[PDB]
Every structure is written in structure tokens, then in C-alpha cells.
From a paper:
Complex I is a 1 MDa multi-protein assembly that is central to mitochondrial and cellular metabolism. It oxidizes the NADH produced by oxidation of carbohydrates and lipids to maintain the redox state of the mitochondrial NAD+ pool, reduces ubiquinone-10 to drive the respiratory chain and oxygen consumption, and pumps protons out of the mitochondrial matrix. This proton pumping contributes to the proton-motive force that drives ATP synthesis through oxidative phosphorylation. Here we define the inhibitory drug-target interaction(s) of a model biguanide with mammalian respiratory complex I by combining cryo-electron microscopy and enzyme kinetics.
Author numbering:
A (entry chain B): 25 to 179
B (entry chain a): 1 to 70
C (entry chain b): 2 to 83
D (entry chain X): 1 to 114
E (entry chain D): 20 to 70
F (entry chain H): 1 to 318
G (entry chain A): 1 to 115
H (entry chain K): 1 to 98
Amino acid sequence: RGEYVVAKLDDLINWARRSSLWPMTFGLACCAVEMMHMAAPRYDMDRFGVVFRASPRQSDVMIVAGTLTNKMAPALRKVYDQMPEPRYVVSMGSCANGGGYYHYSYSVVRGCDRIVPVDIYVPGCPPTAEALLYGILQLQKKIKREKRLRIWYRR
Amino acid sequence: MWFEVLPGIAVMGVCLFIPGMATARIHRFSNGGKEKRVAHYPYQWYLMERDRRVSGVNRSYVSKGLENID
Amino acid sequence: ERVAAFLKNVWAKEPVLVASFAIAGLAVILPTLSPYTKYSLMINRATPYNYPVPLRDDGNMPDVPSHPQDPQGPSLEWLKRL
Amino acid sequence: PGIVELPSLEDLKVQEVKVSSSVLKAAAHHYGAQCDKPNKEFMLCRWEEKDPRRCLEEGKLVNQCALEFFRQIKRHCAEPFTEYWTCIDYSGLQLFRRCRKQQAQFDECVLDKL
Amino acid sequence: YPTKETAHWKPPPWNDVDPPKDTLVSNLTLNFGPQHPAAHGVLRLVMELSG
Amino acid sequence: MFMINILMLIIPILLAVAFLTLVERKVLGYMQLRKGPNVVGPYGLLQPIADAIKLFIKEPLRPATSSASMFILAPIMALGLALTMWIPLPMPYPLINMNLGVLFMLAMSSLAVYSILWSGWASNSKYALIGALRAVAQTISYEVTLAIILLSVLLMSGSFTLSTLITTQEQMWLILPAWPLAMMWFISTLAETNRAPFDLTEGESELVSGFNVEYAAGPFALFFMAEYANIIMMNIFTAILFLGTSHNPHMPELYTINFTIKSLLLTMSFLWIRASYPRFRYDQLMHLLWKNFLPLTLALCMWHVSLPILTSGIPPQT
Amino acid sequence: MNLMLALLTNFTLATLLVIIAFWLPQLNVYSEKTSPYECGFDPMGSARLPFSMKFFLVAITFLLFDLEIALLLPLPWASQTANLNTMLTMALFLIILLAVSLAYEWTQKGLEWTE
Amino acid sequence: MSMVYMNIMMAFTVSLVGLLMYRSHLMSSLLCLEGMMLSLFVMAALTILNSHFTLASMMPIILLVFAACEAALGLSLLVMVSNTYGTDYVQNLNLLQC
Amino acid sequence: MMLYIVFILSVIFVMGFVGFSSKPSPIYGGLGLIVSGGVGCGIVLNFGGSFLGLMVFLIYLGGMMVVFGYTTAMATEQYPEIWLSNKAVLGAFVTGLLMEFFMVYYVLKDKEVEVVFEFNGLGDWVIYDTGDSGFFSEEAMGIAALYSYGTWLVIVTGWSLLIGVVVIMEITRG
Amino acid sequence: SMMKWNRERRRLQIEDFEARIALMPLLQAEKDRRVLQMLRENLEEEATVMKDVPGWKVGESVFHTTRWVTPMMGELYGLRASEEVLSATYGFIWYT
Amino acid sequence: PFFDVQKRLGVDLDRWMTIQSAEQPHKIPSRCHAFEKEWIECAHGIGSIRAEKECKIEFEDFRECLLRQKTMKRLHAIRRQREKLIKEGKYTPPPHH
Ligand SMILES: CCCCCCCCCCCCCCCCCC(=O)OC[C@H](COP(=O)([O-])OCC[N+](C)(C)C)OC(=O)CCCCCCCCCCCCCCCCC
Ligand SMILES: CCCCCCCCCCCCO[C@@H]1O[C@H](CO)[C@@H](O[C@H]2O[C@H](CO)[C@@H](O)[C@H](O)[C@H]2O)[C@H](O)[C@H]1O
Ligand SMILES: CCCCCCCCCCCCO[C@@H]1O[C@H](CO)[C@@H](O[C@H]2O[C@H](CO)[C@@H](O)[C@H](O)[C@H]2O)[C@H](O)[C@H]1O
Ligand SMILES: CCCCCCCCCCCCO[C@@H]1O[C@H](CO)[C@@H](O[C@H]2O[C@H](CO)[C@@H](O)[C@H](O)[C@H]2O)[C@H](O)[C@H]1O
Ligand code: SF4
């Protein structure tokens, strides 16, 4: 049966991608400090297979951890475009989510989703390190639900 | 705990043990149960080539003893 | 006195170079003082890479042996005891 | 410029010593002592004459002595010798130092019996 | 003997020293950040480098 | 039967490399008061498999400005040469028994540098170029001292054959009569493998990713597999050189176990060192080798020429 | 043969891994994705512009020193000579002249990088 | 002669022509000098090895040593040429026509 | 086909020479010299000179590493030239290959060839020695003799290398 | 420790080298007959192949001197299967 | 030599490596040792002008040993004549060949 095979192959690639999520070493403001605390020993994001890598060419996730200003917006879009696919964006904190405390500023982008597509929105100012980890595990369960091969089979 | 690092080390150790064990056993299988003949110098190659002719079966590792001298 | 004053200074500032020169000096010096150096050349001479071509016995070579197990010819008793 | 004179295939015939190098190496030291005379007469001939064609007769006496030497071992010390060169043959380098025990058994056998 | 092909030849310097060329060896300019582990994510340090 | 032997060498190499990545992350983790991968498979045992599958289904990118052919060639050279380094290794029997195995390993190590130089240059990006030129400096720093360190050791072994080192060390490890050289050799292998505190051609905190910054997915994985294969191979080389395992011709697997344990611990030492020290500055690496190791290495080379002659202990040629 | 077979197998294995890496994954190529990386902003000047080498003199010295080891690597074999008096003198002579050349370049500030 | 000599002599001639037909980069010509020495090393090694001229086996090694002294000398001048003009172009070295 | 191993490697030897002799960017010229140095090591090794072959490869790998560094510093342009990018480089490259291909085609067809001088194309093995059985490498004995017979060679080479360091320091001290 | 072990290794090398010296006479005698046999066979099959050739003389030397000259590889294995030629020319160099 | 200081001082600087029949390590002989010895001894002391004609036989044999051009011509001819008969179906090699 073709369906059974592509169903199992979807599980394999979905498992491999969520089990090995490499965020780009990309932080913007206060929220990056809680992101640092997710890598710290108490939460040890490495133990889920989550490893920071500096190069966008070697990153699977962009965690927008902090305010995105207008001056920074073209750079964030640049490094997002330079990530190979599949790629995911996690929006962390009120600033990234929708402008937050600086929503009405002349120099702030009112939400990073004006610039890049966003898979998960982590609320808080900042979200606790555990709240960000909950957001990453939520991203994993989203990847687990993907049906690329199943949809390809029925094209 | 630190001993939870051991399982990955053991897997790494078994994988690194395989090439040495495999090479040693394939040499015995391919050389009639003995070590592969080592010929670093022309003299050693000469004798090995002479053993190939002497074997009568074109194998330098098939040995002939007293039973071959009448 | 200056022998120790200079040496102490380099020991404090560049012990790596002090060790280098001391080791190099021993390499140059000890080979001429060692009593075992003479055997290095004897062992190299006693190693037979070549066939020992026999000599045509012409009737008057007493110092040469007729058989490999004859008393004549060089011996390696010194080598077994080294 | 001339025809190269080659011996006929008949003249090149002799009963070969068909044993392996491990057998030859295991018996080398005794063979060096027992067959010294024809061996050293062949090697003087080759080095003086500088022509393989000019030492064929001496070559055959080297072979004949070798066969006679190996027949003595077969008659009197076959089993101790077969153990010894079997040990030598195992080594990839055919090292003497791995078979001192079997060498001693072979050495004392030939000493007592020959 | 002046000729057309040597009309542009000038006598060499009196002391053999030709003046140094005004050629400019350009420094390499590098964007160090913002996306950089050592730039704290928001520093665009524009650095001129020779090597 | 030789083709089977080749596969029984390089399939295990790549599997050992994959699980060395897990071991490093766990060892670093516990040294950092955390755990490291323990969710993907029991005790993280499936984590290397996940990463490998992830990368090879990731989109590979050819940069717009890159030189296409050289961009592809470099990772192929990196992994190909890394696997070639293993063929003369006596464990205890080499796959290929070479008269000049040590010289072969030196030559192949030099050729592997060009996979760094060409990948960085072919990327046509500034961080990649800076990384590649750091590899030029690194090679200039260690290569001369590395060869002369080996020479001094081989003056006791008597040959360039790797299997002779087993014979040389049958009574005693060469680490005893040559621990100063072992010290300098061990550091040189860290520089040779681009390992911390000499991780300069990648230098993440400085160059983002250095020579491989433009590489993604499978092409990037080839560079990772190459480096980690060289780390294991260089510690096997260190074990053979200085911690010779006794070889029983009738029980060759006892050699393999003892030798494998030694090589593992030396590899663990590389991870341990990475966990402990800050990074060198790449000009300070060059001054380390030329101003400290080289004067000492030259002196010790003089000593190890003279010592066998003066003690009447020159090794056999064969 | 064994050697050529081993090299061919290694470099063929590497080539196959690259072939799979390029033909198996789904691709989506556009201009911005393949643009050169420089931390988010476009590069200023080509990466092919000259890159000054501050260790140029050590690099040339490496060539001379790298040939010395070619002269020294035969030393294990030279130690089997019967004429050990000459061999030991010439071996030490060569290494000392290497040390003298190093000491000269060191004292003359050849090992310091140009600033 | 044996057929190997056809390609080694050909390789020497190719590099000699490469040396004598300059382009712009001075580095490219220095490479052709190094290639010429490589063919001479191989050509000499074959003769010596095939004829069993035992003592001549060191001659190719000596050839490489003075090859490096030439390459190091060539690179030293390239550094000075580059410092003066900012390129290694050989058309800049035309001051001495006059 | 394997009996023609030295010939095949020598063909690649020439192809590498045509590579860097046509003079593309020195980056690619260095690549061509590495290939030639690699196969050149293979040629010499097949004549019984394992040490000579590996040594020339090792030296030339170190030399081309320096050349690479100097190239990115002093011999680079905005658009480095490959063999296809330039008309003069391509013409020399093609001319070299065609001259090479025709020498190969005719030497194989006739088992002989006249290219100025006569070369025999029976295969290179025919000239090899027929009787070897010593317990040493003759190349290793000859090279090691540099330290017992070559006292004079050791002195002049050692002195030249020392002077070489002194000279490059002088030449590059503006 | 290394001094004592290397001294013993040198005494072992001498024993190994002497066993070869004992056997060299026999090996030399075998090599001479084999070389002469191969050359004789080459001569038999030269006559048949080159019987019809106008000016050919079978077995003619290229040397003015009548001194024995050691044959080169092509002379000895000139008319034999590539398997034997390849083994005789490159067998030693290609052995691992 | 233009200035023969080696002879005046009786010091051997380079003539130990001038010829292949000179003393080699471990008495390893060159392949053409006999031929070059015969040529050198034929031409000794009489000068090149005489040696060019009076030692022509020795030099030609020595040249044949060195480059083997006449042997390769001979073998090329036999191998050609064999392929002539193989295709024409006029000769079957023996089993031993
Ligand atoms: C050490 C080496 C490690 C190697 C690891 C190897 C990975 C092992 C696991 C393989 C899982 C199966 C592959 C699935 C991943 C495919 C990537 C993907 O997600 O594509 C989604 C795409 C989705 O396409 P789509 O049609 O649904 O939509 C994409 C188009 N737009 C953008 C418009 C929507 O799937 C496919 O297109 C085809 C899926 C086929 C799955 C079977 C793969 C066959 C492999 C042959 C490929 C041909 C090239 C030869 C390569 C070598 C063959 C081995
Ligand atoms: C910048 C220029 C620097 C030049 C430096 C030159 C330093 C040379 C120092 C001398 C090196 C050799 O030193 C010398 O070695 C030989 C053998 O090796 C020793 O000779 C000793 O052993 C040999 C055999 O091994 C015996 O023949 C001899 O009877 C015995 O005395 C000498 O006793 C020793 O004086
Ligand atoms: C036979 C081989 C073993 C013998 C050692 C051979 C190598 C000798 C190395 C050079 C020795 C003298 O040359 C060298 O001169 C310079 C002067 O600028 C000194 O260097 C000086 O500045 C440099 C850089 O700051 C540092 O090394 C040091 O702080 C200081 O001493 C070295 O301390 C001295 O070692
Ligand atoms: C990157 C590009 C690299 C280009 C490399 C170019 C390599 C050069 C090609 C050399 C090809 C040599 O080709 C070789 O010629 C000889 C001709 O006798 C053939 O040898 C032949 O000998 C006998 C003659 O009795 C035939 O019966 C046999 O069938 C045939 O093998 C080889 O089978 C062939 O392999
Ligand atoms: S969301 Fe809050 S914590 Fe995060 S960057 Fe904005 S202000 Fe700082």
C-alpha cells in the first residue's frame, strides 16, 4: 500500500526534524536573556536536541527574542531568507508578538509577523525560560503533525 | 548522572572495535587460517612468489612440507 | 659569579630556551664521552645485508675459515653479552 | 651481433626442492651448516663466472645436497620439524622469536639423531 | 637619437628613486553583527580590516 | 574479500563518528552541570540518527557568488581523505600495510587542508575567506614541528612502518622515554584537527562559522563527519605512537580491545580539553609552536639522534 | 590494486553522499536565499578583494623549513650506516644550522607579524 | 625511449612554454617555474630508479631543496613588487626601459 | 590496462601541467600543480621510489598552501579567471589537450610514436629489472647515504638554506 | 629500557638475516635455471612467429659483447599473459 | 673541473657520485655496471678524441644497456609479427606463454 508507506515515511522525516531543531544564534533584547536561561543547566535545551548554531545556513528555527525595530527589520528578513528550508519562526515576547511596550513607537515594527511568517507565539514580557521551552515543545508537536508526503501522494 | 554517558561510549567503543577485529579475521579466512604474509622488502616478495609456484594451486599461502620431498 | 647570575635570569624568563640549549648540548657532548658509542658501529658492521662471497682457497689463508663453524673469522660473543 | 647461447630445456632439468619458505626458514640454520660446501662452491662459481650458464652443474649439486639434507630430516625428525615450521608459517613475518619452544624440540632432535 | 617611439622617455631620477605610487590598497570592510554571536544581536560593527 | 574489508572499515568509522557527536554533547553537558541529549532515544542514543537524517533532507544551498565546482569538490575531498587516513592503521593489522605509513599519513593530512582552503575560497564570502586564511596560518604553525616530533620518535622505532611501533613498544610504552615529545605531539594534534583551544578556522564566536559558514544540509554534514573522523584517527595514531598495545598473534582481538580503550580515552581527553580552556588567538598559536615547541623539538631531535648511538641502542632497520 | 580500490571506494562514498544531499531534499531557490552571508546586511565590496597577509615572512620561512625535514626524515635509515662518526656529525650539523636560522629570524624580528 | 619519457618531456616543455608566455600575474609565472622543477624531479627520479644508480637516489631530494630556495626567493620579490604597485602585474615592472 | 599504469598517470601529469601552464587564476593553477604533484608521486612510486614520490608530494602540498595564501593577498582580482572565462587561457588549454590527445592516440595505435624524437609504446614495464631479492630498499639506502657519502652535499645545502633565510629577510625589509 | 630492547632486536635481525644467507645459494640456483628456461621458451616461440620474416635471425643479440647480460622485463616475459607480466613487474610494489 | 683543487688537496668532494660503477652503499650494483666499467677502462687515459672512435664498441653496448632502444625495437617487431599471424589464423601461442 502506498498510503501506509508514505505515512511511515512522514513519521520518519517529521521525527528527524523535530528531534534535531537548531535555532539560529539570534537574539534582540531582554527576551534573549530568558533564551539564555533555556540553554542554562536547569532547562538544558540541548537535552531535547536543541542546539544553537550561528550560521543561518545551519539553522532550522529563528527565535525572534526581543524588539524588532525598523532599522533592524531588513537584517532580520535577510537572515531568515538565508535559512534553508524547512525553516520555522518562533515569536518570543510581547515586543516580537505585536510591539509590546513599544507598540506606539515611531521606530518599532508592530509584530515580527509583518516581516516573517510565524509558527509559534510565546507570550510574556519576557516569557519565563520554561514558557519558551513550552513554546519549543509546541513547535515540535506542530512539526510532528506535518503531512508533506501524505499530501504529495494525493496530488 | 554521569554514568548515563556510558551507553553512548560503549556504542562508540563497539563500532571502533569492529574494523580491527574484521581485518584480522578476514586475513585468516583469506590466507588459510594464518596471518597475511607481510612483504616489505623484495626478498620477502620473492619467497612469497616462490611459494605460489611451489603450492601447485597458485596460492602463496598453501604450504608444502616434507611430504613434498620424496 | 656571572655564570649563575645569567643562568638564573634565563631560567626565570625563558625556561623553554634554557631547556633547549641544555638538551642540545648533551646531544653534542655525551656521544664523545660514552663508552658504549663504539658498539654502535660494531653492531652496524655485524649486520649482514649482503651475501658473504667465499674466497678461492689458494692454499695459504690460515686466518680464513673453511666452514662457518670453524674457529676462524670474526665472532659475535661480544654481541651476545651486550 | 651474435646468437645468445642458451642451454636446452633438457640441460636445465633437476629435481626441485618444492617446500615453502617457512620450511626453508625453519631449516635454514642447520641447512647452512650441513650443505656449506656445495653451496659455497656454487656461489664462488657465480661470482667469478658472472654467467648463470657457466654454473649449471654447480647449481644441480646445490639442489642435490638440499634434497639429501631434507631427506635426513624426514627420516629421523619429521614430527618435531613439522611442528616447528608450522609455527613459523603462522607468523606474517615468519619470526623466529615466536617459536623458541618448537625450535628447541627440533634442535635437540637433530642433535641427538644426527 | 630621438625617435617617435621614445618621445615619451624621461631621464631617470637623479638618485634612482622613483616617487611612491599613490595607489590605495583598500582595507576590507566587514559587517560584524548584528546577527553574530559576539555582537549581542543588535550591534552592526562596521570594521575596516587589513588582514 | 578485500571489498568487504573496506566496508567493514568505513561503515564503522562513520557510525563511531555519529555517536562521538552524542558522547561529546553528553560529556560537555555533565561537565557543564547539565545532561545533554537524553530525550531522543534512551539516553539520547537516537540523537545522532535524527541529526543525520535532518541534514540530508535539508535544502542544500549553492551561494550565488560561489565557484560551483570547487564548492562541491571541497566537502567530497574532506570526507574522502578523512576515510583514507584509516587504511594504514594497524589495529593490529592494517588494511593496507605500507612501508612508509607515517609518511603517507603526513602527506594525506597536508592534502586535507585544501578542503578547508577551497571550500572557504569557493564560498566567495568574507567570513569564509577569513576562516580559510586562518587554516593557512594554522598549517604553517604546526606542520614543521609535527613532522620533526614524529622523526624523533621514529629514531627509536627504526622505520616509518606503523606496525613496527607495536614491536618497538612490546616491553614498554614509548610515552616513558619520550614524554616531552608526547606532550608536544598531543598539542599538535589539537591544532592539526582544528580542535579547541585551536578551533580557529571555524571560530564560532569570532567568524560565525568561518570556512564553512555558507554550507548547509548534506554538504555541511560532510565537513562535520570529516573533522570528527580525523579527531578519532589522530588519537588512534597517538595511541600507537606512545601507548603501544602488546600484540598476541593468536589472540588479535585482545590487542583490539586494549587499543580501542586507549584510543577512546584519548578522544575523551579532546572533549575534556574543549570544556576547560578559552580559545587561542591565531597569531598566538603561531608563536606557541615556533617560539616554544620548535626550539625544544629541534633540541630533542638532536638528542634522539645521538642517544641511540651513544647508548648503542640503535633499532633494527627491519 | 588494494590501495587504488580503497581510495576509489572512499571518494565514491563521499560523492554518493553529496548526490543524495542535492537530489533528495525539496528545493526553493530565490535571489535573497542564495545571497552572500554577512550577519544580515549586504556585503561592502567583493570577497575577492586582496586580503593582506601579516605573517608573510613566516610563510616564506615555512617553505625553507619544510624542506629541511625532507633532509632529516632519512635519519632513521642513515643511523644504520657503519660510518657513524660522519653521519652523526652531519646530522647534528644540519639541525644546528636550522636552529641558527631560526634564532636569526627570531632575533631579527621576522617572527613578529606586520601591524 | 620508453613511453613514460614522452609525457615527462612533454610536461617539461609545456611548463617551459608556460613560463616564456607571460600573462599579467607574476604569481602565475612563478607557478610555471615550480612546475618545471617538478617535471625535472620526476624525469631524474625515473632514470636513477630504473638504472639502480643507488647513490644518485639522493640527487632528486637535493633538487627539491634548491627548488624551495628559488620559490622562496621568487615569493620574496613578489611581496616587494606587490608593495610597490598594489598588484603583482608584470606590466608595472617597465621603469627600466629608460 | 593495468600494465599501462605509469602511462595513464603520466597523461594526467601533462593535463595538470596544461592546467597551470595556461595560467588561469593562480588559485586554479595551484590546483593543477597539486594534481600533477599527486600523480607524479604515483609515477615515481611505481618505479620503486616510495620515499621520493611521497616526499615530492609532501613538499609541493606545503608549497601550494603558501602560494594559496599569497594569492588571496597579492594575486587576486574581482573576477578570478577559470579556464573557460578567458579566450587566451582557453586557447592554450585546448591546444595543450589536443597536442596531448594526439600523442596518446598515435603512440597507442602504433605501439610507437615520433614526436620530434622516437618513443616506444610497448608499455613502460618492459624496461624494468627482472631480479630483485634484497632485504632492503635500494632507494632508502641511496638516500640515507647523504649523511655518510654526501658530506659535501650536506654542507652546501645546509649553508644555502641558512643563507636563504638571511636573504629573504633582507629582500623584504623595505 | 629502550636500549636493552633495541640491542635484542638487533640480535634478532642478525639471526633473521643469516637464515636468508643460508638459503641464498639454493634460491640463486633456482633463479638461474628459471631465467634460462624462460629465455629458452621465448626463443622457441620466436622462431615460429618470425620464420617467414626476410632478414630475421632468431635469437640475435643486440650487444657487440658476448658477455652474459641480465634480461629486462620485456625480454623475459615478452610473450606471456598480462596476469604474469603484471605480477612480475608491479606485484611487489602493489602488495598492500 | 676548471680548477682541480680536489686533486691538489686529495679531497673527494663530488666525484664519488659521478659514475654508477663507483662504490655504492652495501655494494649494490647498477644495472649497467659491467657496461660502464668496460667503457671507462677502454677510454681511460687516451683522451676523448681517441676514445670517440677506439672505444665505440664499448660505448654503443653501454648505450644499449642504458636506454635499451635496440631491444625495444626487436621486441616491438616480434610482437607485431605475432598479431599479424593471430588475426590471419596462422599461429597459436603455447600454453606456457
Ligand atoms: C549518512 C547519510 C544519511 C542520509 C539520510 C537519508 C535520509 C533517509 C530518510 C529518507 C526519507 C524519505 C525522503 C523524504 C524526504 C524528501 C524531502 C521532502 O520533504 O520533500 C517533500 C516533497 C513535497 O513535495 P510536494 O509536491 O508535496 O509540494 C512541493 C511543491 N510546492 C512547493 C509547490 C508545494 O515531497 C516530494 O516532492 C517527493 C517525496 C518523495 C518521497 C520519496 C523519496 C524518493 C527518493 C528519490 C528522490 C530522487 C533523487 C534520488 C535521491 C537518492 C535516493 C536515495
Ligand atoms: C654551525 C656548525 C655546527 C657544527 C656542530 C658539529 C657537532 C658535531 C659533534 C660531534 C658529533 C660526533 O661525535 C663523535 O661521534 C663518533 C661516533 O658517532 C664518536 O666515535 C665513537 O664511536 C665510533 C663508532 O660509533 C667509533 O668509531 C669511535 O672509536 C668512538 O670514539 C666520537 O667519540 C664522537 O666524538
Ligand atoms: C639546537 C636547537 C635548540 C637551541 C635553541 C635554538 C632556538 C633559539 C631561539 C632564539 C634564541 C635567542 O633569540 C631570541 O631573541 C629575542 C629577542 O628579540 C628574544 O625574544 C624576546 O621577545 C620575544 C617576544 O616578546 C620573546 O621571545 C621574549 O619575550 C623575549 O626574550 C628571545 O628570548 C630569544 O630567544
Ligand atoms: C581526466 C581525463 C583522464 C584521461 C586519461 C587518459 C588515459 C590514457 C588512455 C590509455 C589507454 C591504454 O589502453 C591500453 O592499450 C593496450 C594496447 O595493447 C591494451 O592492451 C591490449 O593488449 C593485448 C594485445 O595483445 C590485447 O589482446 C588486449 O585485449 C588489450 O588489453 C589495453 O587493454 C588498454 O587498456
Ligand atoms: S517582550 Fe518584554 S522582555 Fe522581551 S524584549 Fe520586549 S520588553 Fe524586553
